């Protein structure tokens, strides 16, 4: 890189677009710029994440499909993560997302950002604004957009994508779609929510949105002060995650300590997202996860995310709530003004799980 680049990407105000991390990577830097250093932890944990397998949740044999249940019911109470094998979702698609993600963070920095991003308007390319000096920036470079329902697609990002990506990238939204859909129906079956009689789960993620991130995490040369995406909790309904290449990453909390997660060959990670925790009355539980970097190998990955519509209605849902389960959260907010909410929230304080218990 040449001494301009450099100076772009390393003399920052705030208010400035986030940097590119992958281009920041070639620089080659013997200390990373103080912004990646995290300022404020747990140890390390075999346990490993349960698997479900897709097939034998689906299979018309009873005893087959009982025993998945069972699993899937255990992984969603106890862990909160979960692999998912033999899930339907054709191997070549997998690996064309897996090749044109590849591809598309390999383009140059005005290939990967020819979308005109209107003010206010998050989506394609980029981490966002730097907004102070104390904010601490992830090592890793983003891609992130509405895939459901159509209207929320931003046309001229779509536009705009290389053609290869943008058909695998269609398609896989709706194998993701698919494939969330049998999990929430499941999940609805395992808790005995009898949707026909109340308001229940599947409903509101059927026509709820749909959106992806694209993650490129880079090698860092100072890993233990760096990190790939900061501790947190996913907010909504159900995240699915395709690890890109066999470079692990993924952490997630269990009991105090960090737990690594490697993905199976042919599994995607499947996790409960906070506004579902709310829905199933803190049965099954949103689990705060990170992912790390390393010095050697950069890491790629895509989650798709599974929301409410706007407009739906969040409570725990009402058969949940009995003596022995009883309401253990607020109820009657739509999801879009809970994520409004959320934004601004409380400086210091609690978790957005704490501030809706009763
Ligand atoms: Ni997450």
Same mark, same amino acid.
Request: proline content about 5%.
């Given at each position: ?7 772009? +990407? ?22 990373? =710029? ?7 932890? +747990? ?37 909160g ?41 998050? !989506? ?6 730097? !907004? ?17 329902p159509?209207? +929320? ?11 290869p ?44 949105t749909?959106?992806?991130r ?23 309904? +159900? ?23 490697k ?44 929301? =409410? ?6 409570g ?43």
């Open positions: 890189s040449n001494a301009m680049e450099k100076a772009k +990407l390393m003399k920052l105000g705030n208010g400035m677009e986030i940097p590119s991390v992958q281009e920041l990577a070639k620089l080659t830097l013997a200390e990373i =710029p103080s912004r990646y250093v995290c300022a404020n932890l +747990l140890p390390m944990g075999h346990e490993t994440i349960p698997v479900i397998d897709i097939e034998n949740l689906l299979s018309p044999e009873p005893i087959i499909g009982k025993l998945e249940l069972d699993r899937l019911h255990f992984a969603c109470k106890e862990w993560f979960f692999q998912v094998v033999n899930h339907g979702v054709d191997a070549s698609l997998v690996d064309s997302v897996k090749s044109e993600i590849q591809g598309f963070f390999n383009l140059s920095m005005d290939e990967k950002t020819k979308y005109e991003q209107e003010d206010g308007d998050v !989506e394609g390319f980029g981490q966002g604004f730097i !907004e102070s000096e104390d904010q601490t920036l992830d090592w890793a470079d983003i891609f992130m957009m509405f895939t459901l159509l209207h +929320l697609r931003k046309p001229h990002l779509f536009s705009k994508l290389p053609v990506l943008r058909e695998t990238i269609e398609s896989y939204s709706s194998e993701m779609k698919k494939l969330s859909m049998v999990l929430f129906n499941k999940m609805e079956k395992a808790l005995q929510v009898q949707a026909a009689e109340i308001k229940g789960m599947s409903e509101v993620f059927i026509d709820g749909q959106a992806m694209m993650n490129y995490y880079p090698p860092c040369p100072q890993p233990n002060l760096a990190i790939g995406l900061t501790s947190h909790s996913d907010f909504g309904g +159900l995240t699915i995650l395709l690890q890109i290449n066999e470079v692990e990453g993924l952490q997630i909390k269990r009991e105090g300590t960090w737990i690594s997660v993905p199976l060959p042919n599994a995607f990670v499947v996790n409960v997202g906070d506004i579902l925790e709310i829905m199933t009355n803190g049965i099954y539980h949103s689990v705060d996860h990170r992912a790390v970097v390393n010095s050697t190998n950069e890491r790629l990955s895509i989650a798709t995310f599974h929301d =409410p519509s706007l407009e739906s209605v969040i725990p849902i009402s058969s949940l709530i009995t003596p022995e389960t009883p309401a253990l959260f607020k109820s009657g907010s739509t999801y879009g003004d809970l994520v409004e909410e959320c934004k601004t929230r409380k400086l210091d304080g609690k978790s957005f799980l704490d501030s809706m218990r009763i």
